[PDB]
Design an enzyme around this catalytic site. Structure first.
Site, short mmCIF file in Angstrom:
data_model
loop_
_atom_site.label_atom_id
_atom_site.label_comp_id
_atom_site.label_asym_id
_atom_site.label_seq_id
_atom_site.Cartn_x
_atom_site.Cartn_y
_atom_site.Cartn_z
N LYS A 67 -7.51 12.68 -22.31
CA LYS A 67 -7.49 12.30 -23.72
C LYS A 67 -6.89 10.92 -23.94
O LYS A 67 -7.36 10.16 -24.79
CB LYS A 67 -6.72 13.35 -24.52
CG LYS A 67 -7.31 14.75 -24.40
CD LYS A 67 -6.64 15.72 -25.36
CE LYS A 67 -7.37 17.05 -25.39
NZ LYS A 67 -8.82 16.88 -25.71
N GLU A 69 0.95 12.65 -31.34
CA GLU A 69 0.18 11.92 -32.34
C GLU A 69 0.43 12.49 -33.73
O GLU A 69 1.27 13.37 -33.93
CB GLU A 69 -1.31 11.90 -32.00
CG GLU A 69 -1.97 13.26 -31.94
CD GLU A 69 -3.45 13.16 -31.66
OE1 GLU A 69 -3.95 12.02 -31.52
OE2 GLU A 69 -4.12 14.21 -31.57
N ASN A 129 -8.31 27.42 -33.20
CA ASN A 129 -8.87 26.09 -32.92
C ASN A 129 -10.23 26.20 -32.23
O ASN A 129 -10.58 25.38 -31.38
CB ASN A 129 -7.91 25.25 -32.08
CG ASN A 129 -6.57 25.04 -32.77
OD1 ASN A 129 -6.37 25.49 -33.90
ND2 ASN A 129 -5.66 24.37 -32.09
N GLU A 178 -16.66 13.64 -31.78
CA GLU A 178 -16.03 14.41 -32.85
C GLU A 178 -15.01 13.57 -33.59
O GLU A 178 -14.21 12.85 -32.98
CB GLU A 178 -15.38 15.68 -32.30
CG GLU A 178 -16.32 16.56 -31.50
CD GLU A 178 -15.62 17.75 -30.88
OE1 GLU A 178 -14.39 17.85 -31.00
OE2 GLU A 178 -16.31 18.59 -30.26
N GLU A 196 -11.87 13.08 -29.26
CA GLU A 196 -12.56 13.68 -28.12
C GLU A 196 -14.06 13.36 -28.11
O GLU A 196 -14.65 13.06 -29.16
CB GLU A 196 -12.35 15.19 -28.10
CG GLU A 196 -12.56 15.85 -26.75
CD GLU A 196 -12.61 17.36 -26.84
OE1 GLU A 196 -12.60 17.90 -27.97
OE2 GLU A 196 -12.64 18.02 -25.78
N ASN A 206 -17.41 15.15 -26.08
CA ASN A 206 -17.91 16.13 -25.12
C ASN A 206 -19.04 15.51 -24.31
O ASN A 206 -20.08 15.13 -24.88
CB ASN A 206 -18.37 17.39 -25.83
CG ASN A 206 -17.21 18.23 -26.34
OD1 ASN A 206 -17.11 18.50 -27.53
ND2 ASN A 206 -16.34 18.64 -25.43
N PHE A 231 -7.84 37.46 -36.65
CA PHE A 231 -9.12 36.81 -36.93
C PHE A 231 -10.06 36.89 -35.73
O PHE A 231 -10.81 35.95 -35.45
CB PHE A 231 -8.91 35.36 -37.38
CG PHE A 231 -8.40 35.23 -38.78
CD1 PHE A 231 -8.86 36.05 -39.78
CD2 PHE A 231 -7.44 34.28 -39.08
CE1 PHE A 231 -8.38 35.93 -41.07
CE2 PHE A 231 -6.96 34.15 -40.37
CZ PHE A 231 -7.43 34.98 -41.37
N1 LIG Z 1 -5.05 15.16 -35.60
C1 LIG Z 1 -5.41 16.40 -35.94
N2 LIG Z 1 -5.23 16.80 -37.22
C2 LIG Z 1 -5.59 18.03 -37.57
N3 LIG Z 1 -6.13 18.99 -36.82
C3 LIG Z 1 -6.30 18.58 -35.56
C4 LIG Z 1 -5.98 17.33 -35.05
N4 LIG Z 1 -6.29 17.26 -33.70
C5 LIG Z 1 -6.79 18.44 -33.43
N5 LIG Z 1 -6.83 19.29 -34.51
C6 LIG Z 1 -7.33 20.66 -34.53
O1 LIG Z 1 -7.95 20.92 -33.28
C7 LIG Z 1 -9.37 21.10 -33.46
C8 LIG Z 1 -10.11 20.39 -32.35
O2 LIG Z 1 -9.22 20.16 -31.25
P1 LIG Z 1 -9.72 19.47 -29.92
O3 LIG Z 1 -11.17 19.23 -29.98
O4 LIG Z 1 -8.85 18.24 -29.66
O5 LIG Z 1 -9.36 20.54 -28.80
P2 LIG Z 1 -9.96 21.00 -27.41
O6 LIG Z 1 -9.35 22.26 -26.93
O7 LIG Z 1 -9.88 19.82 -26.46
O8 LIG Z 1 -11.49 21.20 -27.78
P3 LIG Z 1 -12.88 21.56 -27.08
O9 LIG Z 1 -13.07 23.03 -27.02
O10 LIG Z 1 -13.93 20.83 -27.92
O11 LIG Z 1 -12.80 20.89 -25.70
C9 LIG Z 1 -9.67 20.58 -34.86
O12 LIG Z 1 -10.80 21.24 -35.42
C10 LIG Z 1 -8.38 20.93 -35.61
O13 LIG Z 1 -8.35 22.30 -36.00
MG LIG Z 2 -13.29 19.38 -29.32
#
Ligand SMILES: Nc1ncnc2c1ncn2[C@@H]1O[C@H](COP(=O)(O)OP(=O)(O)OP(=O)(O)O)[C@@H](O)[C@H]1O
Ligand SMILES: [Mg+2]
Ligand SMILES: CCC(=O)SCCNC(=O)CCNC(=O)[C@H](O)C(C)(C)COP(=O)(O)OP(=O)(O)OC[C@H]1O[C@@H](n2cnc3c(N)ncnc32)[C@H](O)[C@@H]1OP(=O)(O)O
EC number: 6.4.1.3
Lengths: 261, 598, 247
Positions: free
Chosen positions: B122, B206, B241, B281, B294, B296, B354
């Site tokens: 990241k 962050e 998430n 995204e 991120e 993908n 949920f």
């Molecule tokens: N800066 C932010 N502010 C608010 N919500 C955030 C933020 N960063 C991440 N999120 C939350 O996390 C979600 C996406 O997280 P992220 O894509 O970074 O995670 P991941 O586990 O790496 O995802 P993936 O399954 O796509 O690999 C968003 O929809 C939100 O709910």
């Molecule tokens: Mg993501």
């Protein structure tokens, strides 16, 4: 020419000895009689008529088609006779041939005897000395058992059926006696169990002998399967002759009436 | 779908589930022979049957079957396949897998190894995006190693702070700190679970955007430098998430902002030299400001909706790009056509957090393929087993329409006409989300589920009219079963004298209340009086079909009878929610008052 | 409920491994009309299942083995329960449908001392005298005399079907090999040959002991058609006041 006659005589002599003289001696050492001696003691002298004397098993797997594995009669002696002048049909299992295991020919002979008995309306007496089902036969053996079973249920209430266990009956050889009207055992030489002590040790993990698991005492005192137990084969056959006098030959006949003093 | 175009002749799909089935369908349409790998338990799956050739690759666990890279290599060697398609997940974003494939002459359908490793972490991704003149989330660039450093970062970036695990993914190792003590203790804990599962121990600090919207841009690029941003997608509705409802055209975005985001995504892809299909995204705040979050480097799970609104086949485009052909579409050729909504039907219990993963075997499974504007992407079938080894996802349901309202109506119809028996699913949650007033209006954020249901999902709070409709339907079904019970064949020895009853007086217990119902039958029409209110229910009254369609006062309703007992208990799925009712006769209801409670 | 409804959920219900156990109530629910089943003695002798259901609207009696409990083995209680249910169904002209998955009878001294022989004979007798139409489906296993007891074709059965996972054998492969090749004392390839040639429904199929090897998804349909043609079944048996069941 003379070949057919000599072969007939040879097959008769072989069928008289069952599976050999050595195994007959082994049977005698165990304190047990052979099938033919049992039949001779049970029936009136000079009244036995044997059927299917030359019948042999038709299995071909596991090297059972060799001449050394062919025994005319195939571990059962079947026929008809008379007790005190009254007709009866009898089969005696020969423990000498393959441990008395039931093959296709075994079941075919027993079924023929039962069918003829139900046709004429006469009782069936069965001397059981079978080690179970012949494994080399396969599912055929199972089918054979089922056939006998069916006829038992067909004959229930029509003709009396008597079973005398004179040896170690195991496996599926325990359900035909259970379907008959009366069941008698011989002390110290007869057994009745679905599974042997080895399987019980493997699964249940307990130490029991054959006598404890399925002996005559067990089945006449606490199991409730057998009706009476006798000292030996001669005593058992004499008492079977005595008991046969009470019963009628068929349900079409009234209760027997004898001379009274 | 031109057969004249000479693509590969053998493609191995190194994945399972619905994505494998979709790839196999696309390859079969294109004419390419398909080979599918599977585990021992998946020997009777849908994708292995749909494929031309199948190769077992190990036992049930993924670590030894689908992550067993070696066995996949011998499968490729034995089948002599020319291309490999990983789908999403498993080895889709594995650089060392890409190196292994590049060792031989077999090609990997996807982005290059450099692109994958660039976006694998990241912090480097954020640095590259900042170098790529793309708006990024405010924060500190680097790696935090001590609690004091993290709390100091919280000082300069504000009290609302987020701690995130580097790389990883799957919505884990990501939490929020409101205070400096929260910052430090959360940082220590995040290091703890990073060591526990991820093992990277690399953390990012962050800023938390308040009320954000997750907007994705689907980019497609070839090996000649061309790159199109297609359209956007909205995936705000999430729990843990993780997305469960996706919406292809964004209702929050206008043309100008959409074009700006697409151009930024294309610029980032060109900077990375992406040569496949991917997604970028962003988190758009209330003031229509977007920040990069991120990228993908694989096929997106919720890709079918942009296919529906753009009329494209992403799998075919990636196959053509891998073959080396240039893109056959231009940016101006991309257009929005209708509206599209996708719901992820999972094998989870929505009443617990949920959605809590559940296991079982499907005894009945029917999809609403006959409903208008309905597409089903599922890799399961009747008799399928939901195990603990794989993702407990049942299906993806996509509905398209001329506008948002038509798509939502078709989605509701499809959810009502979708039969699952054997496990527990989250259909009730999906229907409640799609019929929610806020969702219909469009004011949705990433915490929609959290604040709409503060105490958790409870079901459908049915109104008075809907309660009367449900009671009338239940009473009519009970009376129909009773009437059917009296239909015997003619005996001719003891004729059957049918009991002539005009009105059925019933006591229906629902929730904790008891209602008095008077039901009358006039053939196929039932007149039902519930607490004075009069309703008419008409239907064919087929008591064997899993779905029953009835008309209550003109309004059409599709219901399911999940259970029924001689004691009067019935479980009825109505409006997506299962209600347990107890119907007794009036005499039985009166005599039941003397029964002692156990 | 259409009589030709397919049941694809039964295609993989039986696990490949013989150690794993499935639920026969699932099969019964899938096959019968509207998935409605009135079970009799549901909490007693749970290794066997008896009950009433409907096929094409006609009342049928169902007897089946439960591999979940005691691996589906037969004992005294299950034998008595199934025997009396079968006797009632036969006495009142109710067709019988049997699902067979049985390894044999339960071993031990408790069963032998309790009269396992005479109680096991009850079920065999009950299936043997039945003159109502009877349809048997073998799912996984049928070993030894348990195969004969559980409504075999040789008991004047009407139609017998086997699923592709059926195993009809005199006994288990290991015991058969060690009882046949005791002199040969070479079980290296003996196990392989015996399981390849006898651990499949083919030995019973080539002798006509089963009418067909059907796909599981057709089961219900295959049953319903049979119940259409066997409704006029009539057999004749020798006259008697009554028979002597081993009570
Ligand atoms: N800066 C932010 N502010 C608010 N919500 C955030 C933020 N960063 C991440 N999120 C939350 O996390 C979600 C996406 O997280 P992220 O894509 O970074 O995670 P991941 O586990 O790496 O995802 P993936 O399954 O796509 O690999 C968003 O929809 C939100 O709910
Ligand atoms: Mg993501
Ligand atoms: C559905 C029907 C079934 O399930 S049949 C299950 C039968 N299970 C068996 O193991 C068969 C024999 N079982 C036994 O427990 C014993 O052998 C019993 C029956 C107690 C005999 O006791 P015993 O006095 O020691 O005789 P034995 O062991 O010396 O046997 C002599 C020869 O007879 C043979 N025999 C016996 N039964 C079978 C049989 N079912 N199939 C094939 N052969 C059988 C034995 O192989 C033995 O051979 P050998 O001459 O000693 O070399």
């Amino acid at each position: 020419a003379t070949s057919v006659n000599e072969r007939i005589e040879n097959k008769r002599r072989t069928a008289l000895l069952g599976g050999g003289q050595r195994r007959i001696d082994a049977q005698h050492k165990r304190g047990k009689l052979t099938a033919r001696e049992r039949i001779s003691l049970l029936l009136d002298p000079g009244s036995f008529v044997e059927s299917d004397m030359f019948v042999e098993h038709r299995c071909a797997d596991f090297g059972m088609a060799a001449d050394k594995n062919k025994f005319p009669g195939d571990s059962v002696v079947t026929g008809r006779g008379r007790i005190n002048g009254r007709l009866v049909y009898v089969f005696s299992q020969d423990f000498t041939v393959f441990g008395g295991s039931l093959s296709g020919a075994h079941a075919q002979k027993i079924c023929k005897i039962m069918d003829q008995a139900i046709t004429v309306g006469a009782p069936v007496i069965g001397l059981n000395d079978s080690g179970g089902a012949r494994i080399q036969e396969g599912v055929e053996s199972l089918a054979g058992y089922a056939d006998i079973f069916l006829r038992n249920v067909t004959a229930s209430g029509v003709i009396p059926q008597i079973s005398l266990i004179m040896g170690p009956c195991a496996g599926g050889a325990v359900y035909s006696p259970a379907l008959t009207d009366f069941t008698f055992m011989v002390k110290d030489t007869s057994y009745l169990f679905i599974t042997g002590p080895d399987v019980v040790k493997s699964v249940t993990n307990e130490d029991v002998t054959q006598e404890e698991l399925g002996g005559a005492k067990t089945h006449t005192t606490m199991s409730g399967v057998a009706h009476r137990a006798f000292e030996n084969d001669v005593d058992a056959l004499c008492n079977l002759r005595d008991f046969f006098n009470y019963l009628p030959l068929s349900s079409q006949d009234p209760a027997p009436v004898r001379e009274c003093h | 779908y031109d057969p004249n175009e000479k693509t590969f002749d053998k493609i191995l799909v190194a994945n399972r589930g619905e994505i494998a089935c979709r790839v196999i369908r696309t390859c079969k349409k294109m004419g390419i022979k398909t080979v599918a790998i599977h585990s021992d338990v998946d020997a009777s799956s849908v994708h292995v049957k749909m494929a031309d050739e199948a190769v077992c690759v190990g036992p049930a666990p993924t670590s030894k079957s689908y992550l067993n890279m070696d066995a996949i290599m011998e499968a490729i060697k034995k089948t002599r396949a020319q291309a490999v398609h990983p789908g999403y997940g498993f080895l889709s974003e594995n650089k060392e897998f890409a190196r292994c494939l590049a060792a031989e002459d077999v090609v990997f359908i996807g982005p290059d190894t450099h692109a994958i490793q660039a976006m694998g972490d990241k912090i480097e991704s954020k640095l590259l995006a900042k170098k790529a003149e793309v708006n990024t989330i405010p924060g500190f660039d680097g790696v935090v190693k001590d609690a004091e450093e993290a709390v100091r970062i919280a000082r300069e970036i504000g009290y609302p702070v987020m701690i995130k695990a580097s790389a990883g993914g799957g919505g884990k190792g990501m939490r929020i700190a409101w205070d400096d003590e929260e910052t430090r203790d959360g940082f220590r804990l995040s290091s703890q679970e990073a060591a526990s599962s991820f093992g990277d121990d690399r953390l990012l600090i962050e800023k938390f955007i308040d009320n954000p919207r997750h907007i994705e841009i689907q980019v497609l690029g070839d090996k000649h430098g061309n790159a199109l941003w297609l359209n956007e997608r909205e995936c705000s509705i999430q729990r843990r998430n993780q997305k469960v409802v996706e919406e292809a055209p964004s209702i929050f975005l206008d043309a100008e902002t959409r074009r700006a985001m697409g151009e930024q995504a294309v610029a980032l892809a060109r900077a990375v030299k992406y040569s496949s299909a991917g997604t970028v995204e962003f988190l758009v705040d209330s003031k229509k400001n977007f920040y990069f979050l991120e990228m993908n480097t694989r096929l997106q799970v919720e890709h079918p909706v942009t296919e529906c609104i753009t009329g494209l086949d992403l799998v075919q485009e990636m196959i053509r790009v891998a073959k080396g052909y240039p893109l056959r579409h231009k940016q101006a050729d991309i257009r929005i056509n209708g509206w599209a909504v996708e719901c992820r039907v999972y094998a989870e219990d929505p009443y617990k957090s949920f959605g809590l993963p559940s296991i079982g075997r499907l005894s009945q499974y029917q999809e609403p393929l006959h409903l208008p504007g309905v597409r089903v992407d599922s890799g399961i079938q009747p008799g399928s087993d939901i195990s603990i080894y794989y993702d407990p996802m049942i299906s993806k349901l996509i509905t398209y329409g001329s506008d948002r309202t038509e798509a939502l109506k078709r989605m509701a119809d499809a959810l009502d006409n979708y039969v699952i028996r054997g496990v527990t699913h989250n259909i009730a949650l999906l229907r409640e989300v799609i019929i929610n007033s806020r969702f219909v209006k469009g004011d949705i954020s990433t915490k929609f589920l959290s604040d709409v249901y503060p105490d958790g999902f409870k079901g459908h709070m049915l109104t008075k009219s809907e309660k009367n409709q449900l009671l009338a339907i239940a009473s009519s079904l009970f009376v129909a079963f009773q009437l059917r019970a009296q239909h015997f064949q003619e005996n001719s020895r003891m004729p059957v004298i049918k009991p002539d009853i005009a009105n059925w007086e019933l006591s229906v217990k629902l929730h904790d209340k008891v209602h008095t119902v008077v039901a009358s039958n006039n053939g196929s029409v039932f007149s039902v009086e519930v607490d004075g209110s009069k309703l008419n229910v008409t239907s064919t009254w087929n008591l064997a079909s899993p779905l029953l369609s009835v008309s209550v006062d003109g309004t059409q309703r599709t219901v399911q009878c999940l259970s029924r007992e001689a004691g009067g208990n019935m479980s009825i799925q109505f409006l997506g929610t299962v209600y347990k009712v107890n119907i007794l006769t009036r005499l039985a209801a009166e005599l039941n008052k003397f029964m002692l409670e156990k | 409920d259409p009589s030709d409804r397919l049941v694809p959920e039964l295609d993989t219900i039986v696990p490949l491994e013989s150690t794993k156990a499935y639920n026969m109530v699932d099969i019964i629910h899938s096959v019968v009309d509207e998935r409605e089943f009135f079970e009799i003695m549901p909490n007693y002798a749970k290794n066997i299942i008896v009950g009433f259901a409907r096929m094409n609207g006609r009342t049928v009696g169902i007897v089946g083995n439960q591999p979940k409990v005691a691996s589906g083995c037969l004992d005294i209680n299950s034998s008595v329960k199934g025997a009396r249910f079968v006797r009632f169904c036969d006495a009142f002209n109710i067709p019988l449908i049997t699902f067979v998955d049985v390894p044999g009878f339960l071993p031990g001294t408790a069963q032998e001392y309790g009269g396992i022989i005479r109680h096991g004979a009850k079920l065999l007798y009950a299936f043997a005298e039945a003159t109502v139409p009877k349809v048997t489906v073998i799912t996984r296993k049928a070993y030894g005399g348990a195969y004969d007891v559980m409504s075999s074709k040789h008991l004047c059965g009407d139609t017998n079907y086997a699923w592709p996972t059926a195993e009809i054998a005199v006994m288990g492969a290991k015991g058969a090999v060690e009882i046949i090749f005791k002199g040969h004392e070479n079980v290296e390839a003996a196990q392989a040959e015996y399981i390849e040639k006898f651990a499949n429904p083919f030995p019973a199929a080539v002798r006509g002991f089963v009418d067909d090897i059907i796909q599981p998804s057709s089961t219900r349909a295959r049953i319903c058609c049979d119940l259409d043609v066997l409704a006029s079944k009539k057999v004749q048996r020798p006259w008697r006041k009554h028979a002597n069941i081993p009570l």
